[PDB]
Every structure is written in structure tokens, then in C-alpha cells.
Amino acid sequence: MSTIALALLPLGSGGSGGSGGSGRDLRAELPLTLEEAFHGGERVVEVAGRRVSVRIPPGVREGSVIRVPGMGGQGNPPGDLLLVVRLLPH
């Protein structure tokens, strides 16, 4: 159950929700451990000083995007955060 750390990519890199207007999207890549890919429980993500434990699906595999609202668009209009799971091919 190795701990993971998110990327928090600035808007671009071939990643854009856009549609929503009031709801600023932000993309972020979680490199996940295969133990957690199997279990599918809460995994503690430490990134940018923020500790957010997300319940990933049992059997979660490469390219699965966990859209968590209120973690992307900060300030006043709550926006979503696109968590792209990144598993090793082996």
C-alpha cells in the first residue's frame, strides 16, 4: 500500500474539461501502486501541502480519471480535479 503524490498539472498537456463555465477544471496525474490498484480503497495523496485521501475503485487501471469536485477550481467557483491513474506496465 505505497503512498502516492499527485502531479497537479497547469491547464494544458493534452487535458482540458472546459465545458462548465462556472466550474474551473484542473488536471492532475496520480502514480498509483499496484497493491492499491488491486484493493481499491482510500489512498492518501500528498501534494502541494494538501493531504487528500481518495477511495479509488477495486481493479482501477491505467487511464481511469477520478473527477473530484472542489479540489480544482479554487477561489470562489468550485471546480473539479481530474485524477488520471498512472500504473506501471509491469
Question: Strands (DSSP E) along the chain, which ranges?
Answer: 26-31, 42-47, 50-55, 65-69, 80-86
Angle at CA of residue 16, ends 50 and 35, nearest 5°:
50
Chain position carrying cell 465545458: 19
Q: What are phi and psi of 34, to 5 degrees?
A: -65, -25
Experimental method, per PDB record? NMR
DSSP annotation of 73 reads S
> Domain tally for the chain?
1
Which residues, listed in sequence order, are joined to residue 25 by a DSSP beta bridge? none
Tally of residues, the chain: 90
All three cell numbers of 57, joined, read 475503485
All three cell numbers of 35, joined, read 497493491
Residue 9 DSSP SS3: strand
Cβ burial of 7 (10 Å; 0-12, 13-18, 19+) is middle
Count of helix runs (H) and strand runs (E) in the chain: 1, 5
Q: Give the domain extent around 55.
A: 1-90
